[PDB]
């Protein structure tokens with residue numbers, strides 16, 4: 001059930017998969033939403049050890065279960081690549097500045 | 105104990121966290137309360153060197169510990185961003201022209 | 209205090225508790241009053257995030273302080289469940305059509 | 313994950329690169345910060361067999377991850393040259409007097 005723990009937010013595999021599908025679709029159509037224009041390139045400044053190859057893109061995953069549509073993104077993100085492979089689930093919660101930590 | 109001091113008001117991390125959670129929930133839903141429509145955009149006219157990125161929003165934090173729900177907001181504010189990250193705690197107390205100064 | 213604000217109407221916790229007790233008593237007795245047969249099932253078409261479980265029942269709360277007894281219902285309603293747990297306080301004021309918005 | 317170790321402080325290549333960029337920028341502008349006026353010339357009294365040519369300049373790298381801005385410098389330093397090339401990472405930790413030893 002609780003496959004990904006981002007701070008106090010708990011996400012299942014289905015939650016991640018649904019958010020990822022939505023994010024990948026916008027990327028594919030070349031569309032973006034929100035003040036930060038998601039989805040957009042994730043450069044992996046944090047140096048996470050992803051098993052899948054780049055380029056990576058970050059997209060918000062909402063604790064409410066709704067698909068991100070331009071409103072408040074919150075602290076959590078799903079990261080995917082050009083093959084629509086899941087790189088990882090990250091969050092600002094527990095990190096300083098605009099840095100991320102991986103959800104466990 | 106006294107994590108943030110706004111004038112003579114002593115706030116703990118828990119106090120700030122509770123205030124931020126209530127304010128962020130309203131922002132995320134797209135709702136506001138009070139004659140000044142909180143939470144509202146904070147443009148950073150004071151130039152606080154926030155570690156997190158904008159857009160910023162200010163939400164009242166009450167000295168009594170009660171969560172703001174529409175009355176007089178007082179002088180104290182918690183500033184959070186769209187990522188649900190705390191930017192800072194500021195106050196009108198001690199600021200000329202009713203602007204803001206940081207809570208220490 | 210002004211614990212709930214439905215449009216321009218201001219309600220205290222006591223006002224809500226009194227109205228709730230009245231509606232739950234009729235529900236328990238299996239009786240209704242008013243043109244719309246109150247209390248009756250609240251389907252939650254609005255999809256509000258209630259902390260208590262369904263089924264839900266809506267019952268009018270009057271600004272005058274009188275307990276509803278079959279007259280004009282007004283725009284405000286208290287929503288409770290089978291265990292007499294308060295789900296929320298909602299209103300038609302500020303909403304479009306026959307919809308409801310939550311009182312703050 | 314521990315590219316450079318100064319005593320007990322663990323530094324990634326990113327930590328060092330970010331520290332170097334900040335220090336070089338100040339040298340470029342002719343500006344210095346802190347009581348010891350950093351960045352300043354490093355004369356190589358320790359006789360490190362650096363791979364890049366002199367002149368060398370020393371600049372503090374903080375274990376907290378923040379960029380040095382004039383406060384307490386700590387024991388660690390990044391050494392870079394006029395071509396913006398990293399010469400090495402050194403520390404006072406484990407050395408007597410005001411001498412330096414290399415971080416490995």
Ligand SMILES: Nc1nc2c(ncn2[C@@H]2O[C@H](CO)[C@@H](O)[C@H]2OP(=O)(O)O)c(=O)[nH]1
Pocket residue numbers: 036041042043044045046058098099100157
């Ligand atoms: N923290 C972080 N930010 C990244 C990364 N890749 C791109 N960014 C963007 O770089 C800037 C500084 O963090 C922000 O615009 C941030 O976008 P988001 O703010 O949308 O994450 C990354 O790997 N880490």
Ligand SMILES: Nc1nc2c(ncn2[C@@H]2O[C@H](CO)[C@@H](O)[C@H]2OP(=O)(O)O)c(=O)[nH]1
Pocket residue numbers: 144145146147148149150202203204
């Ligand atoms: N002091 C201050 N007021 C702000 C800031 N951002 C928004 N406001 C004020 O908040 C109020 C509601 O939006 C407005 O009066 C707006 O001021 P201005 O009218 O000067 O823009 C800010 O950064 N500092």
Ligand SMILES: Nc1nc2c(ncn2[C@@H]2O[C@H](CO)[C@@H](O)[C@H]2OP(=O)(O)O)c(=O)[nH]1
Pocket residue numbers: 140162176177178179196197202
């Ligand atoms: N000090 C103080 N400022 C207030 C109070 N209520 C509103 N304000 C601020 O005073 C400004 C002018 O009336 C308002 O735009 C609002 O700005 P903020 O929302 O930025 O606090 C209050 O009770 N105390």
Ligand SMILES: Nc1nc2c(ncn2[C@@H]2O[C@H](CO)[C@@H](O)[C@H]2OP(=O)(O)O)c(=O)[nH]1
Pocket residue numbers: 244249250251252253254266306307308
């Ligand atoms: N808006 C709304 N009306 C509901 C809901 N559940 C029941 N109703 C009733 O559905 C019909 C259309 O709104 C009305 O009879 C309304 O009753 P009330 O008018 O008594 O609220 C609900 O979840 N939302």
Ligand SMILES: Nc1nc2c(ncn2[C@@H]2O[C@H](CO)[C@@H](O)[C@H]2OP(=O)(O)O)c(=O)[nH]1
Pocket residue numbers: 348353354355356357358370410411412
């Ligand atoms: N240990 C050491 N100090 C140096 C060197 N180059 C300049 N200095 C400065 O020489 C003095 C004697 O150590 C100190 O003021 C020191 O500055 P820092 O303390 O800033 O390193 C060097 O190569 N080694």
Ligand SMILES: [Ca+2]
Pocket residue numbers: 168
């Ligand atoms: Ca109290």
Ligand SMILES: [Ca+2]
Pocket residue numbers: 358359360361
């Ligand atoms: Ca030598």
